Amino acid sequence: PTVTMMQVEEKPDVTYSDVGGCKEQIEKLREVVETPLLHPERFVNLGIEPPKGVLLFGPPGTGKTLCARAVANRTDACFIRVIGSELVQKYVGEGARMVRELFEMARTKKACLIFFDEIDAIGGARFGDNEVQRTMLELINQLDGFDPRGNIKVLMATNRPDTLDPALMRPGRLDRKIEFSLPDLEGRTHIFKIHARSMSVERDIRFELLARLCPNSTGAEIRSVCTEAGMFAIRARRKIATEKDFLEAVNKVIKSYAKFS
Amino acid sequence: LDKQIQELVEAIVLPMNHKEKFENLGIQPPKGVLMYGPPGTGKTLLARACAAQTKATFLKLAGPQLVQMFIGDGAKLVRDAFALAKEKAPSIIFIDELDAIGTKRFDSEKAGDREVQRTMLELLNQLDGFQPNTQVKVIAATNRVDILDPALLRSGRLDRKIEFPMPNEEARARIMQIHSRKMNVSPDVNYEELARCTDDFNGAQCKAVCVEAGMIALRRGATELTHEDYMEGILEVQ
Amino acid sequence: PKGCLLYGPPGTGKTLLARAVASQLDCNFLKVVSSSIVDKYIGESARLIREMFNYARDHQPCIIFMDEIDAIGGSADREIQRTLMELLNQMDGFDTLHRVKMIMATNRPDTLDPALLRPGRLDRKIHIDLPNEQARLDILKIHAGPITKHGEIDYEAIVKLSDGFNGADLRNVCTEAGMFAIRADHDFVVQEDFMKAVRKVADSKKLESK
């Protein structure tokens, strides 16, 4: 369908500055997604095959933002991501020709990077399952198998580490399994540092003050804070955003919404 | 430990192109080799180190793959694997975890084996009544030999019982020497200190050490891998 | 005889005879799993034994192999005894048994359900025992056929120096010495490799003959 051409993500977006405190982990995963792009020939001169990929899992936090990071920082040619929503669909079996045609597009786009999101859609079969066994065994034969190439990028993002087969099949090809490590008390101020390019921000706002009274407030919830800031700024006809104005939106969106959740 | 890689390279290479001597001395091609023992040796990694020496048509096949949800898949995979194997030229295919499905138990508390061992005994029918079986060889390996079918004692079936006597770190530096002889490494490698540092490690763990040495070599300043990056990888991942 | 019992208490050797004739023609094939009783799911395997042996009744010629039947010769053993009652009420059941055949194999004749050892059902039994100086010489002369030898021929030291074995262990050991003769890659095969290689490898099979 049209998702095969929707796989391309043009119109650049959120850049490197949405790192949620993972100053070292962003290198422990950038080393495979963005490092082999500057000098790919030097890795061939090193003798070793270029790295394959890493594994991000655990808590959701600010997930799916690092792919936008990998879109903005990759200023040469955007990559292809495969969400797990396209795998669990009626009339299974389309994912075989779909992964073969996005691998074909990967070979057509001069070694385009390929991403795989939401493995938990078909993960955890625990053997109606044979039709899933085809898609996941063929998925291993196309990803863990060196058929396309042992190359540039393979990755699985998920909310549950209960994957039986990928956990015992990754160490042959994949490596570097790291936790998500959502930002706590030191990353929300930096998500405010990337939200500094939003509606005009008065210099009276202290990002640490707005980022310390909000527990369990990863990029999505504080993204809704910066959204309701400008939204109530329209509802109040304000010209500049100030935390002392939408503090009711802050403690409302975290407290009045943290009462039942 | 070179007699278990040389005995295997022989046991899988000589039944391939020695048919002339097989008809000069009346010798049958060896078929059954049991590459059992504890982990760490890397029976799949070493079977890949020998399959790379053969470079024949390799098809994936595991032990518990017979365990499915519906009926009819086991005969499709057995008769499919021996349909392509029976149709094409003699090649090499390695399987693993054969004991996970070929284990009988007096206690009926929990076990399958109905169609897993009925289909597996259909495979043992294709190795039981098919004398033209001089075609593609199926190498089998188990993780434990506590329970074994007594009917598997034959020259065509599993006879070469290769045990893993806790291979020394020098053997891990030999399979790791083969798994590291391709990179551009500075020719100062005694293999003795980095072998001694690789204790209680697996083959894929040693390849993870070598890859880890291949990770920071860009940011180390030198384009040629050094000697301290191997132990840096050892202390890094494990 | 509608049933046979094959117990080779020393080593084995029944699987190469049943595999000899069965691999030759067998007129059909049908195999019963030794561990086809554990039945993780609901204990309704009886109708599948009626279905399988009912297909065996559908085929006019049929030979059924039950290898390693000493495992079921002991709700663990309850459904085992249920499949044993399927054996009783399907061998002595109601069917025209003038053409069907079945062969039961085991390892040790000590735990073979002496209630099942009652005659009538198990009509045939052949004990494969220590070297009688005749069966090992015959099986040695027929195993020496496909393998090549030199002019110098000796068999008394091979029958005498190899004890506690049968045609299976003698097949694996003699073919092992033949694989040493292909490890010597000559144009002839003297029986020196048969005496020393069958001697030492046979001693190793006596060490690992458990």
Curated annotation (Swiss-Prot), chain A:
Induction data: Expression is not cell cycle-dependent and occurs throughout the cell cycle.
Annotated keywords: Acetylation, ATP-binding, Cytoplasm, Nucleotide-binding, Phosphoprotein, Proteasome, Ubl conjugation
Biological process (GO), any one: proteasome-mediated ubiquitin-dependent protein catabolic process
Chain sites annotated for binding ATP: 58-65
Free-text function comment from the UniProt entry: Component of the 26S proteasome, a multiprotein complex involved in the ATP-dependent degradation of ubiquitinated proteins. This complex plays a key role in the maintenance of protein homeostasis by removing misfolded or damaged proteins, which could impair cellular functions, and by removing proteins whose functions are no longer required. Therefore, the proteasome participates in numerous cellular processes, including cell cycle progression, apoptosis, or DNA damage repair.
Similarity annotation: Belongs to the AAA ATPase family.
UniProt name for this protein: 26S proteasome regulatory subunit 7
Species assigned in the record: Homo sapiens (Human)
The organism's taxonomic lineage, starting at the top: Eukaryota, Metazoa, Chordata, Craniata, Vertebrata
From Swiss-Prot, chain B:
Phosphoserine: residues carrying this PTM: 186
Boundaries of the shown chain within the full protein: 191 to 428 of 439
Physiological role: Component of the 26S proteasome, a multiprotein complex involved in the ATP-dependent degradation of ubiquitinated proteins. This complex plays a key role in the maintenance of protein homeostasis by removing misfolded or damaged proteins, which could impair cellular functions, and by removing proteins whose functions are no longer required. Therefore, the proteasome participates in numerous cellular processes, including cell cycle progression, apoptosis, or DNA damage repair.
Keyword Nucleotide-binding attached: yes
Organism per entry: Homo sapiens
A GO CC annotation given for this chain: proteasome complex
Subcellular compartments: Cytoplasm; Nucleus
Chain ranges passing through the membrane: none
Protein name: 26S proteasome regulatory subunit 6A
Subunit structure: Component of the 19S proteasome regulatory particle complex. The 26S proteasome consists of a 20S core particle (CP) and two 19S regulatory subunits (RP). The regulatory particle is made of a lid composed of 9 subunits, a base containing 6 ATPases including PSMC3 and few additional components. Interacts with PAAF1.
GO biological process: blastocyst development; modulation by host of viral transcription; positive regulation of proteasomal protein catabolic process; positive regulation of transcription by RNA polymerase II; proteasome-mediated ubiquitin-dependent protein catabolic process
Post-translational modification summary for this protein: Sumoylated by UBE2I in response to MEKK1-mediated stimuli.
Disorder named in the UniProt entry: Deafness, cataract, impaired intellectual development, and polyneuropathy: An autosomal recessive disease characterized by early onset of deafness, cataract, severe developmental delay, and severely impaired intellectual development. Patients later develop polyneuropathy of the lower extremities, associated with depigmentation of the hair in that area.
Annotated ATP binding sites: 37-44
Family in the record: Belongs to the AAA ATPase family.
Swiss-Prot record, chain C:
Keyword Signal attributed: no
Residues noted as binding ATP in the record, renumbered to the chain: 8-15
Entire-sequence positions represented here: 167 to 383 of 389
A Gene Ontology BP annotation from the UniProt entry: ERAD pathway
Superkingdom per UniProt: Eukaryota
Organism: Homo sapiens (Human)
Subunit comment: Component of the 19S proteasome regulatory particle complex. The 26S proteasome consists of a 20S core particle (CP) and two 19S regulatory subunits (RP). The regulatory particle is made of a lid composed of 9 subunits, a base containing 6 ATPases including PSMC6 and few additional components. Interacts with PAAF1.
GO terms, molecular function: ATP binding; ATP hydrolysis activity; identical protein binding; proteasome-activating activity; protein-macromolecule adaptor activity
GO cellular component terms listed in the entry, alphabetical order: cytosol; cytosolic proteasome complex; extracellular exosome; inclusion body; membrane; nucleoplasm; nucleus; proteasome accessory complex
Keywords, sorted A to Z: Acetylation, ATP-binding, Cytoplasm, Nucleotide-binding, Nucleus, Phosphoprotein, Proteasome
Gene: PSMC6
Family: Belongs to the AAA ATPase family.
UniProt main location, coarse: cytoplasm
Protein role: Component of the 26S proteasome, a multiprotein complex involved in the ATP-dependent degradation of ubiquitinated proteins. This complex plays a key role in the maintenance of protein homeostasis by removing misfolded or damaged proteins, which could impair cellular functions, and by removing proteins whose functions are no longer required. Therefore, the proteasome participates in numerous cellular processes, including cell cycle progression, apoptosis, or DNA damage repair.
Locations listed in the record: Cytoplasm; Nucleus
The protein, known as: 26S proteasome regulatory subunit 10B
